[PDB]
Design an enzyme around this catalytic site. Sequence first.
Site, PDB file in Angstrom:
ATOM      1  N   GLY A 187     -80.142  31.204   7.012  1.00  0.00           N
ATOM      2  CA  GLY A 187     -81.031  30.493   6.103  1.00  0.00           C
ATOM      3  C   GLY A 187     -81.525  29.230   6.791  1.00  0.00           C
ATOM      4  O   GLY A 187     -81.088  28.950   7.919  1.00  0.00           O
ATOM      5  N   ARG A 229     -82.707  23.403  -2.067  1.00  0.00           N
ATOM      6  CA  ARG A 229     -83.882  22.610  -1.730  1.00  0.00           C
ATOM      7  C   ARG A 229     -84.142  21.529  -2.774  1.00  0.00           C
ATOM      8  O   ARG A 229     -85.115  21.584  -3.516  1.00  0.00           O
ATOM      9  CB  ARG A 229     -85.063  23.585  -1.588  1.00  0.00           C
ATOM     10  CG  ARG A 229     -84.868  24.386  -0.332  1.00  0.00           C
ATOM     11  CD  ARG A 229     -85.948  25.390  -0.084  1.00  0.00           C
ATOM     12  NE  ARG A 229     -85.715  26.079   1.185  1.00  0.00           N
ATOM     13  CZ  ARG A 229     -86.568  26.959   1.697  1.00  0.00           C
ATOM     14  NH1 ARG A 229     -87.723  27.292   1.058  1.00  0.00           N
ATOM     15  NH2 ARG A 229     -86.313  27.482   2.901  1.00  0.00           N
ATOM     16  N   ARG A 255     -86.363  25.157  13.007  1.00  0.00           N
ATOM     17  CA  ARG A 255     -85.384  25.798  12.142  1.00  0.00           C
ATOM     18  C   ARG A 255     -84.836  27.065  12.823  1.00  0.00           C
ATOM     19  O   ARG A 255     -85.589  27.882  13.365  1.00  0.00           O
ATOM     20  CB  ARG A 255     -86.055  26.194  10.818  1.00  0.00           C
ATOM     21  CG  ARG A 255     -85.457  27.251   9.886  1.00  0.00           C
ATOM     22  CD  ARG A 255     -86.527  27.696   8.882  1.00  0.00           C
ATOM     23  NE  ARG A 255     -86.038  28.677   7.904  1.00  0.00           N
ATOM     24  CZ  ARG A 255     -86.663  28.962   6.769  1.00  0.00           C
ATOM     25  NH1 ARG A 255     -87.821  28.346   6.414  1.00  0.00           N
ATOM     26  NH2 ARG A 255     -86.162  29.894   5.937  1.00  0.00           N
ATOM     27  N   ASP A 256     -83.521  27.238  12.803  1.00  0.00           N
ATOM     28  CA  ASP A 256     -82.881  28.475  13.228  1.00  0.00           C
ATOM     29  C   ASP A 256     -82.498  29.080  11.901  1.00  0.00           C
ATOM     30  O   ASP A 256     -81.641  28.549  11.200  1.00  0.00           O
ATOM     31  CB  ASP A 256     -81.611  28.222  14.034  1.00  0.00           C
ATOM     32  CG  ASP A 256     -80.857  29.448  14.461  1.00  0.00           C
ATOM     33  OD1 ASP A 256     -80.820  30.458  13.758  1.00  0.00           O
ATOM     34  OD2 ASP A 256     -80.275  29.375  15.522  1.00  0.00           O
ATOM     35  N   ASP A 310     -94.416  35.578   0.164  1.00  0.00           N
ATOM     36  CA  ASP A 310     -94.877  34.932   1.391  1.00  0.00           C
ATOM     37  C   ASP A 310     -96.209  35.399   1.977  1.00  0.00           C
ATOM     38  O   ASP A 310     -97.041  34.601   2.396  1.00  0.00           O
ATOM     39  CB  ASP A 310     -93.831  35.094   2.472  1.00  0.00           C
ATOM     40  CG  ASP A 310     -92.496  34.472   2.108  1.00  0.00           C
ATOM     41  OD1 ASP A 310     -92.442  33.261   1.849  1.00  0.00           O
ATOM     42  OD2 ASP A 310     -91.510  35.214   2.071  1.00  0.00           O
ATOM     43  N   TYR A 338     -90.269  22.108   2.107  1.00  0.00           N
ATOM     44  CA  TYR A 338     -90.641  21.799   3.491  1.00  0.00           C
ATOM     45  C   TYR A 338     -91.044  20.341   3.711  1.00  0.00           C
ATOM     46  O   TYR A 338     -91.637  19.720   2.839  1.00  0.00           O
ATOM     47  CB  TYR A 338     -91.809  22.708   3.918  1.00  0.00           C
ATOM     48  CG  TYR A 338     -91.439  24.146   4.197  1.00  0.00           C
ATOM     49  CD1 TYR A 338     -90.159  24.647   3.900  1.00  0.00           C
ATOM     50  CD2 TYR A 338     -92.355  24.970   4.888  1.00  0.00           C
ATOM     51  CE1 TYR A 338     -89.769  25.928   4.267  1.00  0.00           C
ATOM     52  CE2 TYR A 338     -91.974  26.252   5.269  1.00  0.00           C
ATOM     53  CZ  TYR A 338     -90.684  26.713   4.954  1.00  0.00           C
ATOM     54  OH  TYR A 338     -90.281  27.948   5.387  1.00  0.00           O
ATOM     55  N   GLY A 342     -74.982  28.751   9.011  1.00  0.00           N
ATOM     56  CA  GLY A 342     -76.144  28.775   9.870  1.00  0.00           C
ATOM     57  C   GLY A 342     -77.253  29.687   9.370  1.00  0.00           C
ATOM     58  O   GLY A 342     -78.393  29.473   9.750  1.00  0.00           O
ATOM     59  N   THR A 393     -77.489  28.662  13.015  1.00  0.00           N
ATOM     60  CA  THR A 393     -76.986  27.294  12.954  1.00  0.00           C
ATOM     61  C   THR A 393     -77.769  26.423  11.976  1.00  0.00           C
ATOM     62  O   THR A 393     -78.880  26.802  11.591  1.00  0.00           O
ATOM     63  CB  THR A 393     -77.003  26.733  14.413  1.00  0.00           C
ATOM     64  OG1 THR A 393     -76.357  25.458  14.434  1.00  0.00           O
ATOM     65  CG2 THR A 393     -78.416  26.511  14.933  1.00  0.00           C
TER      66      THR A 393
END
Lengths: 390, 390, 390, 390
Positions: free
Chosen positions: A270, A298, A216-217, A73, A333, A268, A221
Amino acid sequence: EPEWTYPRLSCQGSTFQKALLISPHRFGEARGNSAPLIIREPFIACGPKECKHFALTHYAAQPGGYYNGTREDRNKLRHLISVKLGKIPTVENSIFHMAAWSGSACHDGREWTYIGVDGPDSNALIKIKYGEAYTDTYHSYANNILRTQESACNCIGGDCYLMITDGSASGISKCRFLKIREGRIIKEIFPTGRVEHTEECTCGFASNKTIECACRDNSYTAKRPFVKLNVETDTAEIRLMCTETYLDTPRPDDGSITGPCESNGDKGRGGIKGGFVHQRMASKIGRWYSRTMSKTERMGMELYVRYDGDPWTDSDALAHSGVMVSMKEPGWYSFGFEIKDKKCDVPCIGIEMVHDGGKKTWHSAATAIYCLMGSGQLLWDTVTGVDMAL
Amino acid sequence: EPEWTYPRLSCQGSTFQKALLISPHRFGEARGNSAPLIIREPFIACGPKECKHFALTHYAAQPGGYYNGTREDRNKLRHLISVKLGKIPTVENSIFHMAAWSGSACHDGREWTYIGVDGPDSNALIKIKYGEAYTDTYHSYANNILRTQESACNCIGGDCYLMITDGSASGISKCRFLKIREGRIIKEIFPTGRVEHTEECTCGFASNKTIECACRDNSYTAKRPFVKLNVETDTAEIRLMCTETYLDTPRPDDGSITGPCESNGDKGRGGIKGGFVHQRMASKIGRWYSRTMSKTERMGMELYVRYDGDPWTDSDALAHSGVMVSMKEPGWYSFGFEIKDKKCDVPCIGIEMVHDGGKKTWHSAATAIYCLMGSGQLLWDTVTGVDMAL
Amino acid sequence: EPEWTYPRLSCQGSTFQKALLISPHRFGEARGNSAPLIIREPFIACGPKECKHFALTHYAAQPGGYYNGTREDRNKLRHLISVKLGKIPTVENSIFHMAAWSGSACHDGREWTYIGVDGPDSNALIKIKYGEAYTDTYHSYANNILRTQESACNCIGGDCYLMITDGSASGISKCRFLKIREGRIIKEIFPTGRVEHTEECTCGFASNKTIECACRDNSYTAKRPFVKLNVETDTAEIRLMCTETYLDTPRPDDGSITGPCESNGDKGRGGIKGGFVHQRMASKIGRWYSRTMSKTERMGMELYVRYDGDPWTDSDALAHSGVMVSMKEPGWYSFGFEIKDKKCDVPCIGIEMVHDGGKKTWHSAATAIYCLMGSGQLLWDTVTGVDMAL
Amino acid sequence: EPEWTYPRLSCQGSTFQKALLISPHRFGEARGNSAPLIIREPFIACGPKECKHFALTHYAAQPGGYYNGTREDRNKLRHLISVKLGKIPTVENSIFHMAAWSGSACHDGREWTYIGVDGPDSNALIKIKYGEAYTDTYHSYANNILRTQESACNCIGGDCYLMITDGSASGISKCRFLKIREGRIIKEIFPTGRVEHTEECTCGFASNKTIECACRDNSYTAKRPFVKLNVETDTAEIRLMCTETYLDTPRPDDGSITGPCESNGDKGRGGIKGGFVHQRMASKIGRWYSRTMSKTERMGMELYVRYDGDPWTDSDALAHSGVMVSMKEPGWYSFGFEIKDKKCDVPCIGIEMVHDGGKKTWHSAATAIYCLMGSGQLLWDTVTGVDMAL
Ligand SMILES: CCCN(CCc1ccccc1)C(=O)[C@@H]1OC(C(=O)O)=C[C@H](N)[C@H]1NC(C)=O
Ligand SMILES: CCCN(CCc1ccccc1)C(=O)[C@@H]1OC(C(=O)O)=C[C@H](N)[C@H]1NC(C)=O
Ligand SMILES: CCCN(CCc1ccccc1)C(=O)[C@@H]1OC(C(=O)O)=C[C@H](N)[C@H]1NC(C)=O
Ligand SMILES: CCCN(CCc1ccccc1)C(=O)[C@@H]1OC(C(=O)O)=C[C@H](N)[C@H]1NC(C)=O
Ligand SMILES: *[C@@H]1O[C@H](CO)[C@@H](O)[C@H](O)[C@H]1NC(C)=O
Ligand SMILES: *[C@@H]1O[C@H](CO)[C@@H](O)[C@H](O)[C@H]1NC(C)=O
Ligand SMILES: *[C@@H]1O[C@H](CO)[C@@H](O)[C@H](O)[C@H]1NC(C)=O
Ligand SMILES: *[C@@H]1O[C@H](CO)[C@@H](O)[C@H](O)[C@H]1NC(C)=O
Ligand SMILES: [Ca+2]
Ligand SMILES: [Ca+2]
Ligand SMILES: [Ca+2]
Ligand SMILES: [Ca+2]
Ligand SMILES: [Ca+2]
Ligand SMILES: [Ca+2]
């Protein structure tokens, strides 16, 4: 000079359609002669005459010798780059804006604002550029990876709004909004409500008075945090999306989270950044969203829409509006953006389609675009066409 | 027409931050498909709308077959080239301005002036180009490699000032300044003061009345010759900077040169061009400088600042303001430049980070950019990411 | 709209200097990553803001697989191409204007006129393009390789003049001039005098009233045919250059052709297109010329000048004004052109430097530029730097 | 704003001549360094200032690893791309407009309209883009590969007309015309007449009142369906061209289809899109057409003309006006277009010259351009110069 830009009513339409695929690695074979940049977190933002296709490069091309490390990242080499939408983002076609391992950008009617975060994890830095000039920064307020949208910021009358957060991706991340004008932060907005964990917000104008974001959480959740920000008072409130069509990945089955709208539910931990864009009509408001087809990985990407109501109280299922990417293809994404037609704005969702072969090879992505176009239903899906062995 | 450019007050800010890395050879692998130009002596100069990234190419790319000779300073092939800052300086992205093995350039508000020196060592020649047209030349006055800044010249109200020198790099080199208007030398300026050896001046505006420069003495001292040039009288005077923080490389330990401000001291032979840029405030002037982290080798680069005072008489240490390049990475030439924001000027320093594997392989450089940005302290360093074996 | 262009007085200066080398094959190695176009017969023409570097490509790149046939003059694939001067003429940077194995081009103040000849040898065709639009043609009047300048045409007040010829390269070639306005032939000028064999004229304005050209006689003399064309009556007369400094290749020793100015002399068979450009002063006229350094082969290139007099009656030696290319380097076609400064015109000569390894390998060229620049004498020569084995 | 484009009288001239060859695969050798896009169905359309060269890429380059599938007509990867006419359509030079396996485009004086069809065969979709924005769609009406021209649409006073069809390529395909203004369909036009099968119409303006088109019948005849569309009443009528010079491929011998003008005749199954363009004079109209030299294969291309008369009832032969592509070279689709000169329009025909080595290798094409230019007769043919083995 140029007038400042404002959200306008959307162009007439009632379905999205496949518009354009930018698949740079269709030309990355070792026997070929091109240099697609290795990237992730693409997004698009448009000005009055042109759109720019942004991404975070690892500063490496395919074919090349710097694949190791391209699945991480943050590092000292990642940069925010762009090309005009429709051009292939290669070494030479791209512009390098600034060092950044988290980004955003937007046009206000007169000029582009570029946002790039870098620095050490414990003390990172939002850097703001207005055109050519580096103009301002914002400091890490929680010393745990200050970060931002990975999609377009949103400008009205010269004021550009940007969601940022800092703090734990596994615990509390109290987010904030910055109001930036001509590259300088002129206000810091501290949201109210459910502010414990909001990531990578996808924002857009619901009207001249309200920005909304679906976020995004990453810990609690699979319901998306939903932001309503009043642009006139510069106040924001956040509450979970109540729809049983949970838009995050991972997620449980639809309708399976019992209890009131605020209930967190299972699976929740991730998350994934999700597409969201508005269709502003004289009469009503369309909210378009995308989510992967797998409930846990994904893979795939499907479109959903709901008109009016309050996203915070309505448990009703969103209306399925087409498969943009099948289960066989990567769906990572997604983000909303708007193209400017002569008199109206065209809402679109872009989809990052990551080529992942793990860390022992290159890691990058294609970008698929769907936009509101005519009536009827969505007709075709997108494949990247890339074989990662070549 | 557009009007003439003048120095303005700097944009608000109190620390530099890592802005941009242009690392062309991240794409120069033998198995890649790119053609980064082999260059050295990069610098940046900006007009009202864009900045150009200039360098002296050896007219060769990586991968390629002309690596022999790319470690030499002067030959019949070197050329002054540029790209828009942010573009990778590749064979096709660059423009070739003129044959040159020493260069400078600057914009006066209306047009670019390009400066390139070539010709035999004993009779070299300054050539000036205004836009597309070659407009004037200046001849060698000491018959020993006439040469110039390797950084931006500086224009005010249409008059562009340029440092040049001629003479032995291990003996006397008395510099001169040229006043150039629309590509033609309108005045020669002969400095006064400690004039026995001044090289590669990095110059900028302290105000509308004064250009100051931090230069290299390659023969006698590790203190930098410091020029104050009065633009209204077109006179200049040079004295050694008195700070114990000697900015040259090699250099002895800080504060070890005893005696008065003009004393040459120890470890004087050899040198490096150094970054310097001004932060002009309404009642205070910040002088920002860079020097290698090693006292003897071109390894690392650290930032320093001092507000007000007289560089010619203040022996006080410069305040350390961040590691821009670690001891592990190359730190070769540095230079100052300013980006034009809408109402103010943004001071920056760029750092040439040479890839040196000796005479046996290609020889070239990345360019790192740091700029005044926000407040707080400098947060991260720059690595080129290049493995010279690929 | 834009004003039509006219010749203006030349910028102040009294010597040429080395300006720029475009050596595309410096990047053509088999192990490199570039695609320089294989070309010959380069020339440059400038408009008010930019110059374009033209050539006749064989529609093949180095490295590539179409080298066989690139040493032939005419075929069905050769095209007139250009790039902005200073860019490297590769596959992608170039523009293909039209099919052509003989060319010319020029800007009139408002738009570009491109001229390209193709068709079978016995019945070829001049095609004229004005901007994007093909606008006119001219037919073969002697059915033996209708052909033109291989250098810039010359426009005054919207009227562009172009030398053409047709007929034997070994016998009689009676040339003609075309007057072209907005891409259409509006007059055909039949010259008077010595009209038996005039090839590849290099033309330019001596004043607003006179175009002059120095041409090649491929069968009878090493003296250059010299054209004086009155632009107001649209009449031309041609006579040999009387100077003992014979500018063609091959040639005998200077001063060795006995008898009056019109005497043909020995070593007249064969020839080369030669550079010529004017320096128009308020008071006097400089005529600058170039010729190879070898009297028999296309090696080297030297500059010569003479002020005033009549080229048709004056046997005096031209003044040697510098070695632009030494005997060790290729010196093939040369051409004059003028760059537009803000208030005056800069005269320049360009030199085609052919990479010739015979027919069993690729055949192409570099372009060297020298222009009037300052005072003193010409200081440095040009080498291509290309090793044809790589 | 700029104003709307209208057809004007054609520029003076009486013969076409070879103008330009865009042969991308001359640079696609495995040992080369270029990336020509694999394409088919090229066409050209021009606005007031420039022409664009459009094609349908398979999103693959030569050399490359995705050659399998490049001989197919339809898939999820094909895209409509363009370059400025004269640029080589390479991965980096091209812009990708939209996903499309059938296309069209045209400029109305103010902006470009791009047309791209994709979607499943049984439910495909016309998508329209005005500038950068997707503005409208049109749905399949016969559920059998909705498809369009593969050549320029045609705008007058802001209204752009486009042929589309849907139905069996070996049965009934009744075409329709869309009237599109600023990217939105404002009217559907249902033709009258011999309407049972009309494909890939090549359309242009016979006057300010009439668009005419020469189309393909893929099922019943080798005579071309000929549309006359009245722009003032927005009505269209179709009849077979009665000329004995049958323009389709395959075709029987000229004049062998006996009986009245509408008789279908022999060798009717199969077809090819054909070039057609108008030469509008004050009192005469020239209709220029192209057809392959072979009666049965896509080999060669010859030009034909007829002035005045009624294409629907004249059985007289078209006059042969030159061999543009010899029997030895590929002659696949051809199309008409017009370049805008300052006061008049220049009619041209382009020829797709496909490189076909079967399903086992890459499949793509060069584009040859011929235009009305001067007088006399057409002088030379076009070869692609490509060896498909390299
Ligand atoms: C949850 C979204 C942002 N985070 C969490 C950052 C974080 C980790 C640990 C502690 C605190 C913060 C992510 O990781 C994002 O995830 C992903 C991802 O694909 O899931 C991609 C982004 N490249 C990355 N962002 C950054 C800035 O690293
Ligand atoms: C001292 C800075 C300039 N000099 C001295 C030139 C000289 C040598 C010998 C006698 C007289 C003059 C350098 O060598 C510079 O050094 C360096 C360097 O890295 O130190 C880079 C420059 N490419 C070179 N400039 C020229 C014009 O050659
Ligand atoms: C003498 C200058 C022009 N000619 C003679 C053409 C000709 C041959 C035989 C009979 C009649 C005419 C040349 O050959 C030129 O020479 C040369 C050359 O380098 O000598 C290069 C040109 N590519 C060629 N021009 C053409 C159009 O082929
Ligand atoms: C007849 C011209 C259009 N058709 C018929 C399509 C069709 C097939 C079967 C049933 C119905 C429709 C073609 O096949 C065209 O042929 C050709 C061709 O070279 O003949 C090229 C086009 N790429 C293709 N177009 C499409 C849209 O597929
Ligand atoms: C928003 O306000 C602007 C400026 O007053 C206006 O022009 C625009 O059309 C408005 N947008 C709406 C009503 O959605
Ligand atoms: C310099 O002078 C100009 C006017 O000539 C003015 O506009 C500018 O702000 C001044 N800048 C400084 C730094 O004094
Ligand atoms: C030529 O004539 C033009 C137009 O009258 C003039 O502007 C230009 O300077 C003249 N050139 C000379 C005197 O060489
Ligand atoms: C068509 O009409 C326009 C005006 O609407 C005119 O300017 C143009 O010359 C006309 N062209 C023809 C071919 O009649
Ligand atoms: Ca989650
Ligand atoms: Ca590249
Ligand atoms: Ca020193
Ligand atoms: Ca001769
Ligand atoms: Ca190429
Ligand atoms: Ca048929």
